[PDB]
């Protein structure tokens, strides 16, 4: 298999930026108080 | 073609989380002063 790895890979980075975007939102409060 | 789209897709989200991680670093200064 090969395309299956891509499908699992894109979902992984989808998860990366998803959780990472949550991090930006956490600093938002650290800036806002 | 199909796998070519995946290759361009993963690089896109790679770019997404890359630039997004740069955003977290910008708020770091907004928290640090």
Swiss-Prot record, chains A, B:
Coiled-coil stretches noted in the UniProt entry, renumbered to this chain: none
Region entry Leucine-zipper, spans: 6-27
Changes after translation: Phosphorylated by the cyclin-CDK PCL5-PHO85.
UniProt superkingdom: Eukaryota
Induction: Translation is induced by amino acid or purine starvation, or during growth in low or poor carbon sources. Translational repression during nutrient-rich conditions is dependent on four uORFs (upstream open reading frames) present in the 5'-UTR of the mRNA; these promote ribosome dissociation. Translational induction occurs in conditions reducing translation machinery efficiency, leading to ribosomes scanning over the uORFs, and increased translation of the mRNA. The rapid translational induction is followed by transcriptional induction at later time-points, independently of the uORF sequences.
Subcellular location: Nucleus
Traits of the deletion mutant: Abolishes recruitment of the mediator complex to the upstream activating sequence (UAS) of amino-acid starvation responsive genes. Decreases RNA level of genes involved in amino acid biosynthesis and cofactor biosynthesis during amino acid starvation or methyl methanesulfonate stress. Growth dependent on amino acid supplementation. Sensitive to amino acid starvation. Sensitive to purine starvation. Decreases cellular glycogen levels during glucose starvation.
Protein family: Belongs to the bZIP family. GCN4 subfamily.
Record's function text: Master transcriptional regulator that mediates the response to amino acid starvation. Binds variations of the DNA sequence 5'-ATGA[CG]TCAT-3' in canonical nucleosome-depleted 5'-positioned promoters, and also within coding sequences and 3' non-coding regions. During nutrient starvation (low or poor amino acid, carbon or purine sources), it activates genes required for amino acid biosynthesis and transport, autophagy, cofactor biosynthesis and transport, mitochondrial transport, and additional downstream transcription factors.
Quaternary state and interactors: Homodimer. Each subunit binds overlapping and non-identical half-sites that flank the central CG base-pair in the pseudo-palindromic motif 5'-ATGA[CG]TCAT-3'. Interacts with the mediator tail; the interaction with GAL11/MED15 is direct. Interacts with the SAGA histone acetyltransferase complex. Interacts with the SWI/SNF chromatin remodeling complex.
UniProt note: domains: Residues 89 to 100 and 106 to 125 define the N-terminal activation domain (NTAD) and the central acidic activation domain (CAAD) respectively, which can function independently to promote high-level transcription of the target genes.
Protein's UniProt name: General control transcription factor GCN4
Full-protein positions shown: 250 to 280 of 281
């Amino acid at each position: 298999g090969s395309m299956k790895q891509l499908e699992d890979k894109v979902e992984e980075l989808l998860s990366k930026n998803y959780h990472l975007e949550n991090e930006v939102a956490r600093l938002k409060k650290l800036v806002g108080e």
